[PDB]
Ligand binder design. Structure first.
Ligand SMILES: Nc1ncnc2c1ncn2[C@@H]1O[C@H](COP(=O)(O)OP(=O)(O)O)[C@@H](O)[C@H]1O
Ligand SMILES: Nc1ncnc2c1ncn2[C@@H]1O[C@H](COP(=O)(O)OP(=O)(O)O)[C@@H](O)[C@H]1O
Ligand SMILES: Nc1ncnc2c1ncn2[C@@H]1O[C@H](COP(=O)(O)OP(=O)(O)O)[C@@H](O)[C@H]1O
Ligand SMILES: Nc1ncnc2c1ncn2[C@@H]1O[C@H](COP(=O)(O)OP(=O)(O)O)[C@@H](O)[C@H]1O
Ligand SMILES: Nc1ncnc2c1ncn2[C@@H]1O[C@H](COP(=O)(O)OP(=O)(O)O)[C@@H](O)[C@H]1O
Lengths: 346, 346, 346, 346, 346
């Protein structure tokens, strides 16, 4: 879109904490599409998407960045687990499923983005002949699908997750993984796929493949894929401090959410500064003491925390609960420094 | 629904004995949907379902709670065995089957809940032009399916059974299970699925995954799933006393049922207090002496018990059988303290 | 149906010899459906079918009882080999096939039971405008399928054969069987299935699972299945005496059949008492000397017996063959005390 | 087409650097089709396509040549990974997929090449009865598909990639690969395939199979395939000098592209001669120090290079960045002589 | 057809060099169909096709003979690799594919053989109401398909290639091959198959199965197949002399082809007698020095030969190149006595 690299980042800055290199990466990739548009044929179709290979540990924001990037760009998205195409069988759906999925969404993107767009006459004409039975106007599936197929073709964004899980001495008698990248190839290399909405050409689709690559290295990917993964960016682990921010700065952060949800019951809750430090500290503490699952750890802990309130807020209309460091210390309790429990409870 | 956490529990209290933590868990999860509704965009679609991971031994009420929760919430339900997606093949139906199944039910929920709802004119108009051929009015599959797709989207409840049976040194050369949670992922992570009733978006579906986790621990689930299993609740084994209650308090308990069914033959049966103690005692006794299958044990024993009466009630019209501790002791007999039989008969 | 437990048994008594416990079992199960009907909501849908687990050796009448039970109850039946769902592949038809099969039959049951029922006008209206082209009246597939889907739903009877062949140390590295009971589960646990005749709900279907259980024990079935197999009944082996009765009492016994078939050629045959003893004695004798295949053994022996007559009855119009103990002794001959032959000839 | 061997090469010369033998090869193959046309029946259908077996290391231009050849000949193309047909399963799409794919493209080639061709009346008739709803004229799918099926039949070009990966002592217990060439056979040997656009006959299709053949030798292919791979041509590795040219001579070379894309932001960038030498030198340097992935290496390096500018060009409107050898040395930096990084970053 | 055995052979003599026994074999088989026609029912349908088992080394003309036989008999043909039905899977198309394929061709044989046959009015009626839109007349798919299904039924010719590759101590634990001949059986044994053009009955189809049988012997085929392979004929290897003839006598021999193709560029080329000897000598020389691939060897060598001319003929309009033994010696060169190259270049 007309949005500039620095603008895209600010937008992302409002949802993801840290991971600047990554933000910068998706921004360039995205902006590059605005630049291509400006060019003229042949050079226009000539230039291919600047795909990205994010390299980072689970829970640092890899998917989030892509999802958000997609939203801010009003573009058809789609996440997919690379591993999906290896499980003994492959007798379900191949790589084309991705393009189909993505194509469906593109329609569902011009739809809702139309039934409530060019409908500058959902009144004064809907009835008087209520509404509802009005949406079925000006549609024209011949025009609807067109822009949809045009959407995926010009803006689609496929997120290939855990791609490092299909690389590569008894561990060598298995090269099927390489045969996978092979079937994945045509998509990134550009090609045409049949869909119930027409024929979409994956030629200008933006691909974002992430992966821990703790086992393998990007250089182990088949040459064809390395060539089509121009941008290499690495994400970093999150510090307890990062959790502290994520817990409240990102729009719709967890504290904002619980605060809003309880307000619904008529309960005004508040988070003491120290309390947020203790929360994020707990999340981090558990992650290093056991399996570090990144920022996700924040989910189970924040739920364990708001457990009590979350049940009886109904009974507490008109009160103001102040979640201070104590309320936390207690609500959590033994569960953190106790690995036996944490592996279940959190 | 408008029902509050404490109300949902009372409702459940009338069907399930014990397992409070679990009741509390599903109530919060359910209520949270009423709260979300109250919020405003973006925060509305922003908030995701508070999925649950029940951890408990077979026969304690895990499925029941979910089924009941679904009923009390007039919501599309669906149970499914996680193991189902691993059996050598997968050449039948993938994870999308769940969403489709669930979607079908949603229709069948707005249907019966309509053919006998807005039909405030199934008379005075049905005939006089009997009924029956009247139901085919005001329907409008364009509106019928809409709310249906809207139902699964806003209220659907998927119950993933035995999920601990797809986790994870010769026992390590098998990671297919992890590839399963992978394919299960998109559903819980929100996404769109095609169905004969339109396109349902799993984004706001409530997921309840239970599991013994005697083999593995929740922490062994792929990180993405842990993150999406916010609420962790644990159910407890049932004491013989619990059987004693289940045998008569839950609405439509087994004694209520047999009493009603025999009344049909004109036989009024009655259960002596001690007799119910002896029944539940037998159920429990067998469970610890052999394979403890929880409350299910009550089924075969109660059937062994009502065996005799259940056959000749027809012949006994107008009588009143009093099932006392003796009648039980006898009706059961050697079969309990005799493992050779119990493994067959009970 | 309106038939009482004692009546159902008398009916069965006219087709099956012995196996009273089993007869009693299916009768209770069947009658229980008449009782449920009488109840009122909720308790009506609340009560589930009293499924049966027959435990017995091959050839004693397990399937027969179920088939007969089905007939006497004018209910949609269906037998199916549990093993069917394990054979390397499963790339044909899953558990839903059962419900579909069963649903088809239900239609084919309201059909023939209609084309010749409400057709109180297959004359005086069929022609005069022969018949035949008349059956295509009053049908109305919208009403036809309805009762059909209603039939399977309220009366269907699935017979799961050899279920003990999907249970459970090198013999333990195979748990697929358990994954089978898993896929079988939803059916017995009640659920909805799509069919070319509408959507049938397996909730009130009567299930009869039989099995030798010489290898495994019922207690080895997954807990969920034990819980749904309330009634446990055991069938006994058949004595030579039992063969003697089966050979002539059951309606359409083998002697009745051959007698009728030969009458067709104009040959009136008769069975000497001793001859029937010798026949059944042969059947039994072979069964213990080699592989005991129960009452089936009676088929090959009775055919070996009527071999000669069965060919030239045509030539024997107006005669009266008397099959006495001698005729038998001879017709059979060496073939019985000679294992080399019996394993081929009988 | 009317283009002569020497003309085709000049055309290719403008896109591919080096690889003359290969250029010569595709030119002969292509021209041969113009010659065949001139002949008369029978000799016309008698002469078969002069298929090619390119033998060369990854990254030297094998696919490019074929793609370009296809473009210059306005012919339906299609690349496909031979390995694709071996991965455990084959339960997706066989060799016919190739012909179908290729056939689709042929339509999509007469389409765009028509909606904007014989449309010498997309005005003066489109409206006045804007345009758009005009394209749906003179089409006639009966004529559209015809030429399409005629296109693939007379001009189609299938590019079979990595064919040396399906040849052939524990490494001999696997001959499935040979069974692959077997299924691939009919296509090259000429035959008919069903497609949603009619029936295409692969008889006159031009096949280009490439392969490293570092493992196996062409002579190891099944005899039938050797016979149908008339032209054998070998491509050479690329020297750093070759990278230097590729970096700027081929139409739409990478420097041309970045220069154009930045111009979009209002930034006029320039590449110092030495800077291009240093760039190509880096690409080559990394390739020999680690995994040599041919010219592809140029992608990640050129992206690492334009990283900084590519982000803030927006901020730099009206400036003129001069990328000299220094700017490069710096922009790249440690990343090249440092293998730990290169395997990730480049 | 009306053609006699000696006539069929002369026809073949004009395309295949040598292999008389084989020519004789297909002629008898073919003529036998003319004789059957003359007979009267029942003896007419009574007589089955005299199928053939060609036994010979690759490259001697086995397929050619069958293809040619098919052409001269204006009959639906079809080659198919027996191995095709064994490759792990069989989840694509079974033996019926053959009959379907063959049936398609039969239509495509009455089609082109009609659109330009009974069309004695593709003018004087096509326009004047140009042509083209005329072909769609008198067709009548009800008559078109009829003769087509009649074609395959009465004239179809299936060529089963490499059948010796599905026969038969660790090499014995694999009998799947025998199960293949089993599935192949019904076809040769006569039967009916469904097709989009109706139901074709394989009863009178002519089958030609060839095979090296260097591994196994015909006698190893399942008995049923031996019985249906009446005619056993053996083909011989080709001498360098045979190559010399093939190089110029068969209609549309390779020298005829290149001569014609170059004439297109305005270049009149000529082959010195000795030059043809040297060419064929090279083909043979390479075949014995490395892998003997029969006459195919002639393809790569003749292409290596005409390489130079084939490129610049364009530049040589009006010249007359004389390919003498020298031109050859040179054009080939080291490549023949050098195995390292031959295995690539030739
Ligand atoms: N830097 C970050 N800023 C905000 N939220 C984050 C960040 N890193 C992780 N998260 C949160 O943690 C979860 C991480 O999942 P995701 O973004 O897909 O990344 P990854 O795939 O690397 O685990 C999401 O719920 C996201 O909101
Ligand atoms: N706490 C309880 N209260 C009432 N019934 C119970 C309870 N626990 C188990 N049951 C009965 O036992 C069976 C248990 O199955 P279910 O509820 O699915 O739980 P689980 O999956 O843990 O075995 C059901 O028939 C249910 O009625
Ligand atoms: N008790 C019996 N009374 C009458 N017929 C019997 C009896 N037992 C077996 N049979 C006959 O033997 C065969 C037994 O098969 P079936 O009834 O399916 O039982 P099972 O599956 O235990 O072998 C049937 O043909 C049936 O007529
Ligand atoms: N000789 C060359 N001239 C121009 N570009 C080349 C050359 N060799 C390789 N490339 C570039 O490198 C990549 C090589 O891929 P491709 O042409 O498919 O060949 P290969 O399959 O041998 O790797 C393409 O992006 C192409 O532009
Ligand atoms: N006797 C022959 N006469 C003419 N051409 C032959 C002869 N033998 C082989 N060929 C040529 O060599 C190739 C051999 O393939 P084919 O005829 O299928 O036999 P095979 O399957 O035994 O290799 C064909 O291109 C054919 O023209």
């Amino acid at each position: 879109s007309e949005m500039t690299p620095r603008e895209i980042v600010s937008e992302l800055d409002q949802h993801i904490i840290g991971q600047a290199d990554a933000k910068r990466a998706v921004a360039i990739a995205l902006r590059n599409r605005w630049r291509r548009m400006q060019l003229q044929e042949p050079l226009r179709h000539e230039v291919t998407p600047k795909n990205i290979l994010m390299i980072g540990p689970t829970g640092v924001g890899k998917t989030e960045i892509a999802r958000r990037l997609a939203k801010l760009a009003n573009a058809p998205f789609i996440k997919v687990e690379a591993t999906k195409f290896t499980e003994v069988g492959y007798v379900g759906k191949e790589v084309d499923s991705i393009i189909r999925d993505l194509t469906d969404s593109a329609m569902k993107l011009v739809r809702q983005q139309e039934i409530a767009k060019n409908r500058a006459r959902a009144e004064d004409v809907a009835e008087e002949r209520l509404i509802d039975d009005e949406a079925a106007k000006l549609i024209n599936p011949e025009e609807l699908k067109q822009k949809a197929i045009d959407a995926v073709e010009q803006n689609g964004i496929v997120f290939i997750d855990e791609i490092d899980k299909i690389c590569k001495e008894y561990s060598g008698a298995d090269v099927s993984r390489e045969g996978v990248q092979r079937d994945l190839l045509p998509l990134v290399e550009g090609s045409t796929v049949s869909t119930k909405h027409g024929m979409v050409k994956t030629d200008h689709i933006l691909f974002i493949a992430s992966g821990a690559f703790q086992v393998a290295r990007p250089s182990d990917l088949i040459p064809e894929l390395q060539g089509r993964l121009p941008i290499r960016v690495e994400l970093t682990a999150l510090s307890a401090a990062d959790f502290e921010r994520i817990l409240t700065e990102p729009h719709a952060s967890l504290t904002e959410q619980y605060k809003a949800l309880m307000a619904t019951e008529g309960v005004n809750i508040a988070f003491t500064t120290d309390a947020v430090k203790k929360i994020a500290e707990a999340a981090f503490r558990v992650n290093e003491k056991t399996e570090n699952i990144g920022a996700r750890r924040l989910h189970t802990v924040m739920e364990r925390l708001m457990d009590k309130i979350s049940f009886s807020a109904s009974d507490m209309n008109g009160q103001t609960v102040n979640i201070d460091a104590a309320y936390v210390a207690d609500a959590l309790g033994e569960v953190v420094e106790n690995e036996d429990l944490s592996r279940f409870i959190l």
